[PDB]
Ligand binder design. Structure first.
Ligand SMILES: Nc1ncnc2c1ncn2[C@@H]1O[C@H](COP(=O)(O)OP(=O)(O)OP(O)(O)=S)[C@@H](O)[C@H]1O
Ligand SMILES: Nc1ncnc2c1ncn2[C@@H]1O[C@H](COP(=O)(O)OP(=O)(O)OP(O)(O)=S)[C@@H](O)[C@H]1O
Ligand SMILES: Nc1ncnc2c1ncn2[C@@H]1O[C@H](COP(=O)(O)OP(=O)(O)OP(O)(O)=S)[C@@H](O)[C@H]1O
Ligand SMILES: Nc1nc2c(ncn2[C@@H]2O[C@H](COP(=O)(O)OP(=O)(O)O)[C@@H](O)[C@H]2O)c(=O)[nH]1
Ligand SMILES: [Mg+2]
Ligand SMILES: [Mg+2]
Ligand SMILES: [Mg+2]
Lengths: 318, 330, 343, 235, 258, 354
DNA sequence: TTTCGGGGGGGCCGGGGGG
DNA sequence: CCCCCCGGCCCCCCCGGC
């Protein structure tokens, strides 16, 4: 078959600010800005798949209307964004003459701005300062720390928070109603649990489950979406007896095809984020895990090394 | 390249259709259903070496486009340049343009994407998003930690498990039929055991075994042939060595280890692996015995990985096992 | 000035014995039949797979691959059908992507009529990556699809001492061949043949002692035999070479010195052990040889209980591992002797 | 400086303080300047009054544990910057080099926080090694040793045969010094560098200063008023 | 040096043919048969296909005992070709099951001989027969005019939109600094037939193409003074340049309408 | 003039004094040098390894080996940095110390040594047999300081071009030499001279230089202070003669190097005071020692063996000290910044003593 | 400080085209 | 025959975890 079905992430991508779930206060602020205009330079930061690009595009559309094509300059990591681009194309766009209503400005949308080089960011400073009367800049990024301090000083900070399970369930229910998808409460709970606050991941998993099995229930959802291995690693590290930890390692991780490097890196991360355990114990476990990680990187990526790491961790915990 | 009979068995038996991929029934069924109704999403294939990921994606492309699939797909791997410039120009142009031959959608196969740079992966995000109406991406990986979370967020994940024994048996039967070979049940069991779920190992060992037989037509591949060609210890040798270590005194254990190793020139690392596998099933009253065994044997394995004195390493193995098992009394 | 070039046979006649007696064909490889038979069968099967030779030093891996290429192609067609890269050449990721790929994609060189009539001439070329364990992980990863895509005209040979240094995908792609250690049981015939060819006279068991001292390395044994032959020829007495002369040439500690060390350890006094070791290090004995001899003496002694041997085995393993990292021999030896004396 | 001050603060390592400033926060603090954080920690981990000592543990024991961890971290760093470029080990290097040793001696800074002194010492060592190499290859044709052997064995005798004559015979020993210099292809810069190498009770700065200026002027004049041989002929 | 032997009276012809598409593709498989030489290649992006055909009449002498496939790299072939002069005859020579191809430049008047050898490459790109397609529009125009239009409009934008409607051909570009539009109409002159603009329309068409691909395509204007463009809504655009005994064809896929 | 250690260095095999068995073995090797394998001379520092190598070369080729010249070779890295290597060469042999360029020593092996290896011998260097020499000799000093990559590069170079060159590697210890290189070489142990041989050499030097000695015992004492290092013994004799107006008395003291005195003072301080402030002062002393080209391994060895000679320590303290020394010597081998490991060792010793 | 590899930005050099 | 435009090397500088 040479035909494609449009992904539901694109088909049901919000087109207005009112269709975005989560971060209610920021969405209301953006709605007020759209109503009144005078949009300032802004930096929107947050975790993947929470509606940052969607928010920026919706704000630009509501602000500009018919003028969107002329008054919006969009650049992302897939386009050329070197110092020359900033110095020529962005400057030309900023200096461009464009008659707009008495409360609107041209918009430059720099998506994934955290990937831009230091030189381009430095060149953007006086460009933003001088042409603010007619042009405004909207950065979208995952890590606001990558944006240099002078640019942060020039922009309004908007830190997006993770989506609660309630909002994900609400959006999934809207999509299900619009698509007439047969489902069960347990299946939706499994999808939400596996998504971990990633709306895009949740929608993709729902669409894949519907396509592959039809009915959205726990069995089909877990068949399509594998249980995250970090939870398995956490269970392995928290086991009371060495035999149980070895059992988990051999059955749920090693026999499923997970590589030793992945297992050791996930163990390091989980141990780092193990608040239930005393910090000094966590540091000793990290020392052992690092020894094992160095051994694996050298080339000895065997099940015996991971078993020895588990044995040392249990000896420390005892 | 005069004929397909000149190719190594690992490549001469490469599946050409989705019906020739074994041990991945769930993934094959799901992808076949996706393609049948035109609901193919962006795909990720994560799995260990030699499980059938490249074979599966190539078979899927051939099924979608037919024999002339190479000209209608953009395949990139670790042997080709995949920098940020490549993503910006070549991948973008392929994704944004129509097919030359047909009017169908376009497929981009990023094999071994775990070797891609972070900048290229980041550049791929909006490329995947913008052109999803007419283009689809497939990613293949052995190590998931090398893939950025943004890329993983946009793909549907399929895990290729280590090949089950039944699938290996069926493929071995097909290969035996094609090659006009004979294999004993014990030889098949040993081959499956040493495969560790990798089909390439099975095929290479079978080719070596065929090369070993004086008369490949009349002769049959026995476990002895497999052990000789692979130069691996027999289960009886491992059992004898372990029994001597556990029961006999130091002199007798040293003599037995040396004699067993010198009988066929076995490697110490293979003996250590076999003994570890045997001891895994042992029921130990004290967990400290298991702790000592694992730690000391892992240390010895790491030391062997860098060379060193072989006799001292063997004595270390003997002493480590004896000391660890001394903790089962009190 | 200038010197007339020497003939191949004349030049080889005055080479070191290790190079002089390098195998010229697959039939001259001594104790690697389990793999040599498989390689030989490819002369007729003509379906040679990708090969990963791995083994300890001086076991016959490079010799085996060179002999196989010679037998497959012949003296005239070898050069056009072989691309060899080793640790003395740059092998970065860019090199793998460009040069190796370009050679792998080339059409095979046209065989001559004589070559076709005299040699099997398989329809593919060979890329040898000797000392492949020195290549980085990324460069190795760059070879994965090159190996499979162009397997119809190219085959790869990777040779190494440490198989763990090869990434798992490459090891999976290649057919593995382990080269066994060469000892007195499986390598005596070749050494005896070399000694007879060079007319070396030695006492009974001298060759066995040489092979035992070599500890799996036939190159070392041949070099030791050449040294002993040179000594005997210089002496001019005509007497047979003895095991004592071989041991002295090999740097083996005399038994009396080992017994003195054992007695000092038994005494247990730190000052005496330190003084004796300080005097001992002046002789220049290799620490590895001393550790090996001590291990042999202690493990095979019936006057020590199981616990003592259990502890001493781990002590010797730790000392050997530390020495393998290039540590100060004096400090490590003194520490080992003190720790043994405290058992 | 702020990173060193915060990482060595004992409050963040307490039961209550660890839940607010978590281990992830400390790793991020290291990643703020990974290049300089381990150096600052190694520089300032011996200048604190700890408040995290375990019952029965002295300050010296915790210092020794921190030093051991710092050595392990140095090994890890050497691994990172090798031909394999194992940058994925950077987080582990954060724990071994900064977080663990700091947690072992966390407390109140007993004095002013000092910038790392390792870089200046490294530059000085590189300069002195370059000078030693120059001297060694100037005297290679005469001596039989490596540069290390030249520094450890030859230099004291060269001092005895180069500096002592000035202090003992006054200005009448200039000829002997010049003869020795010529025999080993040594120049005036080589003489000064050699005199600059000695440590302990053999320091020559005060001794060189105490020499009468007339003797030094005469030595320079005599050296400049004659031809000398050249060891390495550059072309 | 007997299996395949082809002769070009002037080496400039083969050099110009190679330069016509050397910037589009890198690896090309030339298939030589008794009826002449053909070649088909696809660029790395898989957006442009180049198809070259040269008949026997283009050669002073041509002999090919059996069909032979030769895989070549374009930059190496061009580097070898540029060595020869414009007054020297060229000869392509290949043996049975060759591993290389020989290029011989001859100058009888000066008795000058120049031999070059190029190693062949194994390319698993089977010749894909391009089934003939009916096109909505077929327009033939001078090569210079098309090249000028492409060079002018490519400066403004990276995409060029071609519209064919009743007795009118429009080339449009829209970019950051402005837009450009060129309108041409059919016109025939008997005094200067070489400058005529010929248009045959069945259905109107409107297709967008990448500017870089058009810039590469126009490099074949040297081979022929006129260019024929065939456009259909359901087929890729076909740009053809006619040689004395052959042709060079560029099949360019249009951009997705979205 | 030239120091007595250099002035009286033997220049031939027949001129060697100590280790007659080694001299006979070297003569046997030089009897038929056409098929001489690669040589690896290992032994304690300052025993005469370089002297014996030069004597062997003289026996093989002739006195011309001692006519040495120095040239400079330029190398470029992947980063475009320019490095200079000082090459000591003679008409028959070439000497190199690749470790001079640190991690770039591999370059020397890949370009310089390979270039020399691919060049055949064409100059008519008539030998004792009657024909001309066919190979050149390459000496690698401080071969044990080479990086593993450089040794790997040497691996196949020594085999492919053995017909063109022969390698002689001199080392104070074989522990850092990788197994393949050792397999590729003929190992030669060079024992240190005995006390009597050192005394005889010193007496010959004294007679040649006309030095007044109250009794021969003084020389014996010098030998005892040398610990088998002949170069150190000769230099100490010259220093003592200069200090005592070319007249040695039974009461003349033994002169130690400045760094030895500093290390002994550091050992005394460590034994006396065990505190964090004392550790800071020890760090300052270590920095001073390192800044003046005192290798870290030498510092560690000297400090360990000075601590082990303290009469106030018991057996447990000495055992702990030697164990810590072994551990931190391994750490130094695998480490980059030596000061970290030295400070860790000192802290562990201080904890063990207290 | 810095042992590969990737990315970016700036400087010349030189082929080709135009007048 | 000479001048100008513009593609391609060449070099040098800077991250490298989440
Ligand atoms: N708050 C949201 N409400 C509704 N849909 C959402 C929301 N967030 C994400 N989605 C859905 O997921 C798709 C992708 O959302 P995006 O705005 O691209 O997330 P993102 O944070 O910009 O992703 P990154 O940071 O570039 S990885 C949208 O088209 C929506 O279909
Ligand atoms: N499921 C399978 N069924 C049949 N043959 C298989 C299967 N998997 C692997 N093989 C065989 O092993 C060879 C390699 O299979 P691949 O598809 O390349 O495995 P892979 O997972 O892509 O390896 P990596 O991840 O690149 S190391 C095939 O040509 C087959 O001959
Ligand atoms: N199996 C063997 N049969 C005969 N001679 C051997 C054999 N192995 C080693 N030798 C001898 O030792 C010399 C070196 O053999 P090699 O083939 O170079 O061993 P190697 O395994 O390749 O060494 P490495 O791994 O590079 S240290 C040969 O020239 C032979 O003279
Ligand atoms: N008289 C005499 N002096 C020797 C002999 N061997 C070495 N020496 C002296 O000892 C010095 C040091 O020898 P050297 O080879 O440089 O030491 P090594 O290379 O570190 O082993 C030399 O300068 C000689 O003067 C010998 O056999 N006889
Ligand atoms: Mg986004
Ligand atoms: Mg694959
Ligand atoms: Mg080899």
């Amino acid at each position: 078959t040479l035909s494609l079905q449009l992904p539901w992430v694109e088909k049901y991508r919000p087109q207005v600010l009112s269709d975005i779930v989560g971060n209610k206060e920021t969405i209301d602020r953006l709605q007020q800005i759209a109503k009144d205009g005078n949009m300032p330079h802004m930096i929107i930061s947050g975790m993947p798949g929470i509606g940052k690009t969607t928010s920026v595009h919706c704000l630009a559309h509501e602000l500009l209307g018919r003028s969107y094509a002329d008054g919006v300059l969009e650049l992302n990591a897939s386009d050329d964004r070197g110092i020359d681009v900033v110095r020529n194309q962005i400057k030309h766009f900023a200096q461009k003459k464009l008659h707009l209503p008495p409360g609107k400005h041209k918009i430059v949308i720099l998506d994934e701005a955290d990937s831009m080089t230091a030189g381009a960011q430095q060149a953007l400073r006086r460009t933003m300062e001088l042409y603010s009367n007619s042009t405004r800049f909207a950065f979208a990024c995952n890590q606001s720390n990558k944006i240099i301090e002078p640019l942060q000083s020039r922009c309004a900070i908007l830190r997006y928070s993770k989506l609660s399970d309630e909002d994900v369930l609400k959006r999934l229910l809207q999509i299900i109603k619009l698509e007439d998808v047969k489902y069960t409460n347990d299946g939706l709970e499994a999808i939400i649990f596996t998504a971990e606050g990633d709306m895009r991941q949740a929608i993709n998993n729902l669409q894949s489950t519907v396509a592959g099995h039809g009915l959205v229930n726990a069995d089909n959802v877990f068949k399509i979406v594998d249980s995250p291995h970090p939870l398995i690693v956490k269970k392995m590290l928290l086991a009371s007896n060495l035999e149980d930890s070895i059992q988990i390692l051999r059955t749920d991780l090693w026999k499923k095809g997970y590589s030793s490097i992945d297992i050791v890196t996930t163990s390091f991360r989980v141990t780092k984020n193990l608040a239930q355990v005393k910090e000094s114990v966590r540091l000793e476990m990290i020392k052992e895990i690092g020894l094992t990680h160095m051994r694996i990187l050298e080339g000895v990526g065997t099940y015996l090394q991971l078993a020895s790491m588990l044995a040392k961790i249990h000896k420390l915990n005892n | 390249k005069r004929s397909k009979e000149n190719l190594p068995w690992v490549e001469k038996y490469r599946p050409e259709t989705l019906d020739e991929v074994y041990g991945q029934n769930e993934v094959i069924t799901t992808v076949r259903k996706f393609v049948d109704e035109g609901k193919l999403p962006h795909l990720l294939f994560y799995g260990p070496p030699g499980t059938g990921k490249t074979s599966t994606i190539v078979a899927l492309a051939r099924e979608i486009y037919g024999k002339n699939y190479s000209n209608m797909v953009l395949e990139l791997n670790a042997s080709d340049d995949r920098g940020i410039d490549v993503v910006r120009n070549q991948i973008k142009d392929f994704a944004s343009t129509r097919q030359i031959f047909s009017k169908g959608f376009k497929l981009i196969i990023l094999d071994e994407a775990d070797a891609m740079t972070n900048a290229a992966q980041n550049a791929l995000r909006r490329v995947i998003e913008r052109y999803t109406k007419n283009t689809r991406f497939c990613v293949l990986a052995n190590y998931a930690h090398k893939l950025t979370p943004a890329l993983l967020s946009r793909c549907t994940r399929f895990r290729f498990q280590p090949l089950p024994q039944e699938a290996i048996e069926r493929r071995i039967a097909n290969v035996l039929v094609h090659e006009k070979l004979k294999l004993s049940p014990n030889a098949e069991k040993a081959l499956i055991e040493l495969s560790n779920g990798d089909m390439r190992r099975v095929l290479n060992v079978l080719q070596s075994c065929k090369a070993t037989l004086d008369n490949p037509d009349e002769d049959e591949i026995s476990d002895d042939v497999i052990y000789e060609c692979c130069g691996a210890p027999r289960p009886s040798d491992l059992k004898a060595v372990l029994k001597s270590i556990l029961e006999d005194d130091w002199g007798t254990a040293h003599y037995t280890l040396n004699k067993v190793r010198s009988a066929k020139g076995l490697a110490l690392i293979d003996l250590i692996e076999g003994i570890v596998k045997i001891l895994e099933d042992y029921e130990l009253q004290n967990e400290e015995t298991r702790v000592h065994l694992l730690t000391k044997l892992a240390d010895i394995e790491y030391s062997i990985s860098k060379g060193g004195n072989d006799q001292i390493q063997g004595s270390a193995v003997i002493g480590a096992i004896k000391a660890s098992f001394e903790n089962e009394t009190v | 000035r200038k010197i007339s070039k020497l003939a191949a046979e004349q030049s080889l006649a005055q080479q070191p014995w290790v190079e002089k007696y390098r195998p010229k064909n697959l039939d001259e490889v001594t104790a690697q039949d389990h793999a040599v038979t498989v390689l030989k069968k490819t002369l007729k099967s003509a379906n040679l797979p990708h090969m990963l030779f791995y083994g300890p030093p001086g076991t016959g891996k490079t010799s085996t691959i060179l002999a196989l290429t010679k037998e497959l192609y012949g003296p005239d067609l070898m050069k056009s059908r072989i691309l060899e890269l080793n640790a003395s050449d740059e092998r970065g990721i860019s090199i793998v992507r460009e040069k190796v790929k370009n050679f792998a994609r080339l059409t095979v060189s046209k065989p001559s009529k004589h070559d076709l009539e005299n040699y099997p001439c398989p329809p593919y070329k060979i890329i040898i990556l000797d000392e492949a364990d020195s290549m980085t992980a990324d460069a190795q990863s760059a070879l994965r699809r090159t190996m499979e895509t162009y397997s119809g005209v190219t085959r790869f040979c990777l040779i190494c001492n440490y198989v763990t240094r090869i990434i798992d995908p490459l090891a999976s792609r290649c057919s593995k061949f382990r080269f066994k250690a060469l000892d007195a049981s499986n390598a005596i015939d070749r050494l005896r043949f070399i000694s007879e060819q060079e007319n070396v006279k030695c006492d009974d068991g001298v060759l066995e002692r040489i092979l035992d001292i070599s500890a799996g390395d036939l190159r070392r044994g041949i070099t030791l035999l050449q040294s002993a032959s040179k000594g005997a020829q210089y002496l001019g007495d005509g007497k047979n070479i003895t095991s004592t002369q071989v041991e002295e040439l090999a740097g083996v500690v005399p038994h009396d010195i080992l017994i003195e060390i054992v007695e000092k350890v038994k005494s247990g006094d730190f000052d005496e052990i330190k003084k004796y070791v300080n005097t001992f290090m002046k002789s220049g004995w290799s620490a590895a040889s001393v550790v090996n001899q001590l291990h042999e003496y202690y493990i095979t002694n019936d006057n020590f209980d199981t616990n003592f041997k259990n502890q001493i085995s781990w002590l010797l393993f730790t000392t050997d591992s530390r020495l393998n990292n290039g540590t100060n021999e004096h400090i490590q030896l003194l520490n080992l002797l003190v720790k043994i004396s405290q058992l | 400086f702020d990173i060193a001050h915060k990482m060595l603060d004992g409050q963040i390592y307490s039961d209550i303080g660890s839940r607010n400033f978590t281990l992830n926060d400390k790793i991020a603090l290291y990643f703020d300047d990974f290049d300089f954080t381990p150096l600052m920690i190694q520089e300032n981990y011996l200048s604190t009054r700890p408040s995290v000592l375990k019952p029965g543990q002295s300050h010296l024991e915790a210092v020794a544990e921190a030093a051991n961890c710092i050595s392990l971290g140095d090994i890890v760093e050497k691994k990172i910057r090798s031909s394999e470029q194992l940058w994925s080990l950077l987080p582990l290097h954060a724990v071994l080099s900064s977080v663990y040793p700091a947690s072992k001696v966390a407390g109140h800074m007993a004095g002013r926080i000092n910038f790392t002194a390792w870089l200046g010492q490294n530059s000085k060592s590189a300069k002195y090694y370059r000078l030693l190499q120059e001297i060694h290859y100037h005297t290679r044709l005469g001596t039989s040793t490596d540069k290390i052997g030249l520094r450890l064995d030859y230099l004291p005798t060269f001092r005895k045969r180069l500096l002592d004559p000035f202090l003992k015979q006054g200005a009448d020993a200039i000829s002997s010094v010049i003869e020795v210099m010529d025999d080993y292809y040594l120049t005036k810069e080589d003489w000064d560098s050699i005199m600059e190498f000695f440590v302990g009770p053999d320091v020559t700065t005060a001794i060189i200063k105490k020499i009468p200026a007339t003797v030094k002027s005469g030595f320079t004049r005599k050296y400049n008023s004659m031809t000398h041989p050249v060891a390495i002929y550059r072309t | 040096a007997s299996m395949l032997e082809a002769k070009f009276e002037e080496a400039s012809l083969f050099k110009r043919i190679i330069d016509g598409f050397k910037d589009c593709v890198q690896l090309v498989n030339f298939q030589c048969k008794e009826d002449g030489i053909i070649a088909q290649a696809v660029d790395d992006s898989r957006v442009l296909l180049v198809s070259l055909e040269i008949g026997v009449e283009a050669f002073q002498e041509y002999r090919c005992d059996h069909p032979v496939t030769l895989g070549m790299d374009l930059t190496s072939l061009s580097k070898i070709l540029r060595c020869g002069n414009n007054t020297d005859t060229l000869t392509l020579i290949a043996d049975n099951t060759p591993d290389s191809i020989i290029l011989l430049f001859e100058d009888t008047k000066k008795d000058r001989i120049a031999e070059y050898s190029l190693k062949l490459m194994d390319i698993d790109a089977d010749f894909l027969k391009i089934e003939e397609l009916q096109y909505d529009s077929t327009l033939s125009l001078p090569s210079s005019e098309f090249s000028k239009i492409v060079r002018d409009l490519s400066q403004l934008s990276d995409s060029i939109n071609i519209m064919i409607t009743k007795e009118t051909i429009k080339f449009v570009a829209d970019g950051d600094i402005g837009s450009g539009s060129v309108i041409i109409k059919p016109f025939v002159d008997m005094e200067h037939p070489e400058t005529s603009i010929k248009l045959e329309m069945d259905q109107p068409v409107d297709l967008t193409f990448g500017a870089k691909y058009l810039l590469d395509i126009i490099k074949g204007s040297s081979l022929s003074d006129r260019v024929g463009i065939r456009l259909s809504s359901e087929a890729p655009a076909l740009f053809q340049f006619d040689l004395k005994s052959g042709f060079l064809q560029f099949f360019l896929a249009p951009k997705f309408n979205d | 003039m030239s120091l007595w250690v250099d002035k009286y260095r033997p220049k031939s095999l027949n001129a060697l004094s100590h280790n007659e068995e080694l001299t006979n073995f070297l003569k046997s090797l030089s009897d038929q040098p056409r098929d001489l394998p690669h040589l690896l001379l290992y032994g304690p520092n300052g025993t005469g390894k370089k002297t014996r190598c030069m004597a062997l070369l003289e026996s093989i080729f002739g006195p011309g080996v001692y006519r040495l010249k120095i040239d400079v070779r330029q190398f470029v890295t992947a980063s475009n940095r320019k490095l200079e290597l000082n090459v000591v060469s003679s008409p028959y042999h070439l000497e190199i110390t690749p470790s001079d360029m640190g991690n770039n020593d591999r370059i020397v092996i890949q370009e310089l040594l390979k270039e020399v290896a691919q060049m055949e011998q064409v100059d008519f260097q008539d030998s004792k047999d009657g024909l001309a020499h066919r190979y050149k000799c390459v000496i690698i000093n401080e071969a044990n300081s080479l990086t593993k990559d450089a040794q790997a590069a040497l691996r196949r170079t020594m085999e492919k071009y053995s017909k063109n060159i022969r390698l002689i590697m001199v080392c104070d210890s074989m522990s850092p030499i990788i197994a393949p290189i050792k397999s590729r070489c003929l190992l030669i142990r060079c024992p240190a001279p005995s006390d009597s041989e050192i005394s005889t050499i010193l007496s010959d030097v004294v007679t040649n230089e006309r030095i007044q000695l109250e009794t021969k015992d003084i020389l014996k004492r010098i030998a005892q202070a040398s610990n088998g290092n002949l170069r150190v013994s000769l230099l100490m004799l010259e220093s003592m003669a200069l200090n005592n107006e070319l007249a040695l008395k039974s009461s003349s003291p033994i002169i130690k190097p400045d760094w030895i005195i500093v290390i002994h003072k550091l050992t005394r301080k460590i034994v006396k005071e065990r505190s964090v402030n004392s550790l800071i002062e020890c760090r300052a002393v270590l920095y001073d020692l390192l800044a003046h080209c005192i290798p870290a391994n030498i510092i560690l060895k000297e400090l360990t063996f000075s601590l082990l000679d303290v009469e106030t320590l018991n057996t447990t303290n000495k055992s702990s000290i030697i164990e810590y020394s072994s551990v931190f010597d391994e750490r130094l081998s695998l480490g980059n910044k030596a000061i970290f490991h030295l400070e860790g060792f000192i802290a562990k010793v201080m904890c063990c003593l207290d």
